[PDB]
From Swiss-Prot:
The keyword Metal-binding is assigned to this record: no
Entry similarity comment: Belongs to the bacterial ribosomal protein bL9 family.
Entry superkingdom: Bacteria
Its job: Binds to the 23S rRNA. Extends more that 50 Angstroms beyond the surface of the 70S ribosome.
The protein's assembly and partners: Part of the 50S ribosomal subunit.
GO CC terms: ribonucleoprotein complex; ribosome
GO molecular function, one term: structural constituent of ribosome
GO biological process terms held by the UniProt record: translation
Name of the protein in its database record: Large ribosomal subunit protein bL9
Keywords assigned: Ribonucleoprotein, Ribosomal protein, RNA-binding, rRNA-binding
Gene giving rise to this polypeptide: rplI
Amino acid sequence: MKVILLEPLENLGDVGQVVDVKPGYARNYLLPRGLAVLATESNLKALEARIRAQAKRLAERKAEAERLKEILEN
RNA sequence: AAGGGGACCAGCCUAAACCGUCCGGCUUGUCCGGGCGGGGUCGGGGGGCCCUCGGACCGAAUCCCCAGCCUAGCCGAAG
């Protein structure tokens, strides 16, 4: 089924990406070896929490920047 | 079996959303989930979260106290 990959993974995807596999792969390879995690509501969120948080931390980074763009070059 | 006639008669608590707290996980975070707490219980669909308005009567299957009752008994007419 669906999993959230914790690492980069050959022909599946980049970390954090959500890909769809056969459950045998997931349960006997991916999950045990901390390579991916099941795509449950409960960590489908932790995907987006990490996302939102990432977006905002960059937002301030382009904020206190825009300060240092008008206050500088001036 | 529905139905009709009867017996008895009684209706409730949660899960979830939302809020709070404590605890532990690592990826700190508007995170995730574990407990406890609040909130909620319905088929005129009900509940949550917001806006306005409103403004003591119920009531236990729980806890008391009592009557009554069971576990000995007693009085009891007239040759």
